[PDB]
Design a protein around this nucleic acid. Structure first.
Length: 203
RNA sequence: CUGAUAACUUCACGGCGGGCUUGAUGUCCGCGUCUACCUGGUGAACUGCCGAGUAGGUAG
């Protein structure tokens, strides 16, 4: 919206805290359909608490700002909130060498993330790898189309609408000691013509 | 341009009653520590005088 050549091109995730539990999401009153105003149906949820930090390898070989690099932050991550601090606005900096860039993180108790490139043809493949480690996570890394896709009338932002599935994957721990190349970090989106899987740029 | 957009789980509460861990016991025998060692103040802060004085004062 200010300089239209940003081109972020990748990102890198560093999970410092993780906490999952059941909390319950109270939905609010709707017009039911017979004559009354009550709440909709009840479910259970699962809510999380992520303290993380990001490395971004863009192409913009120039300083950004100090002020509008705060005003341009979004405020949500998977239905959540996204705040930092007042006094952590002095650790936001840009660099041109990614080995001094992991020195700028003022916490030093984290973990990095990659993808586990071993075959997982059923559920029994994962749990065997999940009982040798008990430190690996699974999530949805991409989608999987059922359609070419097609132009449907009330599609959201009017673009082109398909119908997708979810792609399970496996998430790993990395220390980045002195030798792990960054291609196992810095993930992207590659568009393999029927599935939009996010994987790092080493594969 | 995020399984997208919005979202109050709340009110009340007496864990209680009673209680014998006991009896018995041999840690002992032997034993070589030793040899050899430089701490270095030149002359340097000297001589009277009063007072009975190992006290006290006083001169250049």
């Amino acid at each position: 919206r200010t300089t239209s050549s940003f081109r972020v091109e990748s990102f890198a995730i560093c999970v410092h805290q993780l906490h999952v539990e059941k909390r319950g999401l109270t939905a609010e009153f709707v017009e039911k359909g017979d004559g009354t105003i009550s709440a909709p149906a009840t479910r259970d949820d699962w809510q999380c608490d992520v303290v993380f930090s990001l490395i971004l390898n863009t192409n913009f070989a120039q300083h950004i700002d100090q002020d509008t690099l705060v005003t341009s932050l979004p405020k949500r991550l998977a239905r959540g909130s996204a705040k930092i601090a007042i006094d952590d606005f002095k650790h936001i900096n840009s660099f041109s060498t990614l080995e001094t860039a992991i020195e700028s993180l003022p916490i030093e108790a984290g973990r990095w993330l990659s993808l586990y490139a071993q075959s997982n043809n059923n559920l029994s493949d994962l749990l065997a790898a999940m009982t040798e480690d008990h430190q690996l996570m699974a999530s949805c890394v991409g989608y999987h189309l059922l359609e070419e896709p097609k132009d449907k009338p009330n599609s959201l932002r009017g673009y082109k609408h398909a119908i997708a599935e979810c792609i399970i994957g496996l998430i790993n721990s990395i220390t980045f000691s002195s030798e792990t190349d960054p291609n196992t970090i810095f993930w992207s989106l590659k568009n393999y013509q029927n599935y939009l899987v996010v994987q790092p740029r080493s594969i």
